[PDB]
Write an enzyme that holds these catalytic residues in place. Structure first.
Site, PDB file in Angstrom:
ATOM      1  N   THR A  65       3.090   3.298 -15.643  1.00 54.05           N
ATOM      2  CA  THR A  65       3.407   4.284 -14.629  1.00 54.05           C
ATOM      3  C   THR A  65       2.503   5.503 -14.746  1.00 54.05           C
ATOM      4  O   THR A  65       2.226   5.979 -15.845  1.00 54.05           O
ATOM      5  CB  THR A  65       4.900   4.684 -14.728  1.00 54.05           C
ATOM      6  OG1 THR A  65       5.187   5.734 -13.796  1.00 54.05           O
ATOM      7  CG2 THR A  65       5.234   5.121 -16.151  1.00 54.05           C
ATOM      8  N   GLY A  66       2.034   5.979 -13.593  1.00 51.89           N
ATOM      9  CA  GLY A  66       1.150   7.135 -13.533  1.00 51.89           C
ATOM     10  C   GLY A  66      -0.295   6.778 -13.828  1.00 51.89           C
ATOM     11  O   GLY A  66      -1.179   7.650 -13.849  1.00 51.89           O
ATOM     12  N   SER A 101       6.079   1.987 -11.259  1.00 51.84           N
ATOM     13  CA  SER A 101       7.293   1.979 -10.466  1.00 51.84           C
ATOM     14  C   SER A 101       7.414   0.665  -9.680  1.00 51.84           C
ATOM     15  O   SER A 101       8.514   0.137  -9.523  1.00 51.84           O
ATOM     16  CB  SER A 101       7.282   3.150  -9.476  1.00 51.84           C
ATOM     17  OG  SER A 101       6.952   4.377 -10.108  1.00 51.84           O
ATOM     18  N   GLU A 102       6.295   0.136  -9.183  1.00 53.84           N
ATOM     19  CA  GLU A 102       6.351  -1.100  -8.399  1.00 53.84           C
ATOM     20  C   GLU A 102       6.429  -2.371  -9.231  1.00 53.84           C
ATOM     21  O   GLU A 102       6.223  -3.484  -8.739  1.00 53.84           O
ATOM     22  CB  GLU A 102       5.178  -1.174  -7.407  1.00 53.84           C
ATOM     23  CG  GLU A 102       3.792  -1.062  -7.993  1.00 53.84           C
ATOM     24  CD  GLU A 102       2.734  -0.983  -6.907  1.00 53.84           C
ATOM     25  OE1 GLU A 102       2.858  -0.104  -6.029  1.00 53.84           O
ATOM     26  OE2 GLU A 102       1.783  -1.790  -6.928  1.00 53.84           O
ATOM     27  N   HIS A 125      -2.969  -4.492  -6.299  1.00 50.26           N
ATOM     28  CA  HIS A 125      -2.485  -3.701  -5.165  1.00 50.26           C
ATOM     29  C   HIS A 125      -3.225  -2.355  -5.104  1.00 50.26           C
ATOM     30  O   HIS A 125      -3.189  -1.568  -6.061  1.00 50.26           O
ATOM     31  CB  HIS A 125      -0.981  -3.437  -5.272  1.00 50.26           C
ATOM     32  CG  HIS A 125      -0.480  -2.428  -4.284  1.00 50.26           C
ATOM     33  ND1 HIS A 125       0.091  -1.232  -4.664  1.00 50.26           N
ATOM     34  CD2 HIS A 125      -0.508  -2.417  -2.930  1.00 50.26           C
ATOM     35  CE1 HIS A 125       0.394  -0.529  -3.587  1.00 50.26           C
ATOM     36  NE2 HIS A 125       0.040  -1.225  -2.522  1.00 50.26           N
ATOM     37  N   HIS A 127      -5.224   0.767  -2.103  1.00 49.52           N
ATOM     38  CA  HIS A 127      -5.280   1.317  -0.746  1.00 49.52           C
ATOM     39  C   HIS A 127      -6.697   1.498  -0.235  1.00 49.52           C
ATOM     40  O   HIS A 127      -7.234   2.601  -0.238  1.00 49.52           O
ATOM     41  CB  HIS A 127      -4.569   2.670  -0.697  1.00 49.52           C
ATOM     42  CG  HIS A 127      -3.165   2.618  -1.195  1.00 49.52           C
ATOM     43  ND1 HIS A 127      -2.839   2.838  -2.515  1.00 49.52           N
ATOM     44  CD2 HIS A 127      -2.012   2.268  -0.575  1.00 49.52           C
ATOM     45  CE1 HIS A 127      -1.546   2.621  -2.688  1.00 49.52           C
ATOM     46  NE2 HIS A 127      -1.021   2.272  -1.526  1.00 49.52           N
ATOM     47  N   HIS A 194       0.631   0.785   3.803  1.00 49.10           N
ATOM     48  CA  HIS A 194       0.552   1.007   2.359  1.00 49.10           C
ATOM     49  C   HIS A 194      -0.436   0.098   1.649  1.00 49.10           C
ATOM     50  O   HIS A 194      -0.118  -0.512   0.625  1.00 49.10           O
ATOM     51  CB  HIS A 194       1.933   0.836   1.727  1.00 49.10           C
ATOM     52  CG  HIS A 194       2.980   1.707   2.338  1.00 49.10           C
ATOM     53  ND1 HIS A 194       3.599   2.723   1.644  1.00 49.10           N
ATOM     54  CD2 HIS A 194       3.486   1.745   3.593  1.00 49.10           C
ATOM     55  CE1 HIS A 194       4.439   3.352   2.447  1.00 49.10           C
ATOM     56  NE2 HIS A 194       4.388   2.778   3.637  1.00 49.10           N
TER      57      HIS A 194
END
Length: 232
Positions: A65-66, A101-102, A125, A127, A194
Site C-alpha cells: 500500500t502506498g 488497497s486493491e 493495473h 492509468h 480508472h
C-alpha cells in the site's frame, strides 16, 4: 529462487511503467501468483482479509500500500509476498506494509484464474494517459472497436479483444468478481474511468499489453486530432 527472481521481473516492469509515464504517483499495482511455495519461508506477519476468503490456497506477490512504481523498481521492500489461506487470515512473508488497497480485487481475479486459466499468473493495473484521455469521451464505446484494429499488434495480443467494467467500489471483491466475468478468457479489462488491468503468462507479458493498448489509444487519438476516421 524462482520467487526472488520473479521480484526482479516485477521491479523491472515497475521501472518501465514509471519511465514511460504509464504510471504516476501511487496509482498502479502489480500482482503475480506464485505456483510452488516460497523457499525462504519466513512468516513475519498475520493479517485479516477484512472479509471471508473462501477460494483455494495460494502465494502471491503484490505491491504494498502506498507503493509507487518509481520506487518499487528500486526498493523490493515495497513488494509483498503473501500466503493466501481460506478463512479470514492471510500471512505476510515479505514486505514492509500491508498490500495495496486493491488487494481484495486482485484476490478475486487470481482465485478464478487459478481455477479457470491457470496459465495467466500476472496482473498489472495502471492509468495510461491516452487510454485515460480516450475514456473521457462520450462516444467512447464506439471507438474501442476501430481502436482494436488500428494496427495488427493489438489483434495478436487481444485475439478476443477487450471489455469495459462499470467502476463502482475501489479495490472491492465486487470489482474483481465483475472483472473476472468480463475477463472471460480475455487478456485485458478497462475499468471505465480508472485505467486498465492486464493479464499474462508473466508480469512482463501483462506489461506488454498495457504498452500496446496505450499505443493504439495514442494512435487513435492522434488520428482524431486531424479529423479522419469512423467516429460513429
Amino acid at each position: 529462487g524462482h520467487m526472488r527472481e520473479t521480484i526482479r521481473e516485477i521491479q523491472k516492469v515497475a521501472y518501465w511503467l514509471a519511465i514511460k509515464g504509464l504510471s504516476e504517483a501511487n496509482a498502479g499495482n502489480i500482482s503475480v501468483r506464485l505456483d510452488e511455495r516460497p523457499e525462504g519461508y519466513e512468516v513475519k506477519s498475520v493479517n485479516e482479509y477484512g472479509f471471508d476468503y473462501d477460494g483455494p490456497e495460494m502465494y502471491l506477490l503484490i505491491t504494498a500500500t502506498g507503493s509507487r512504481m518509481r520506487e518499487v523498481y528500486e526498493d523490493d521492500s515495497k513488494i509483498c509476498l503473501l500466503h493466501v489461506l481460506p478463512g479470514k487470515h492471510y500471512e505476510i512473508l515479505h514486505g514492509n506494509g500491508k498490500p495495496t488497497s486493491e488487494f481484495p480485487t486482485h484476490l478475486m481475479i487470481h482465485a478464478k484464474f487459478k481455477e479457470m486459466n491457470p496459465e495467466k499468473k500476472a496482473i498489472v493495473h495502471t492509468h495510461p494517459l491516452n487510454l485515460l484521455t480516450l475514456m473521457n469521451l462520450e462516444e467512447f464505446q464506439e471507438l474501442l472497436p476501430k481502436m482494436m484494429k488500428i494496427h495488427p499488434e493489438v489483434l495478436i495480443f487481444f485475439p478476443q479483444g477487450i471489455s469495459v467494467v462499470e467502476f463502482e467500489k475501489p479495490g472491492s471483491v465486487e470489482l474483481g468478481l465483475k472483472t473476472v466475468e468480463k475477463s472471460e478468457g480475455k487478456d485485458a479489462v478497462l475499468w471505465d474511468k480508472h485505467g486498465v488491468v492486464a493479464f499474462g503468462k508473466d508480469v512482463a507479458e501483462a506489461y506488454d499489453r498495457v504498452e500496446i493498448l496505450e499505443k493504439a489509444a495514442e494512435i487513435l487519438l492522434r488520428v482524431l486530432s486531424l479529423g479522419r476516421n469512423p467516429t460513429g
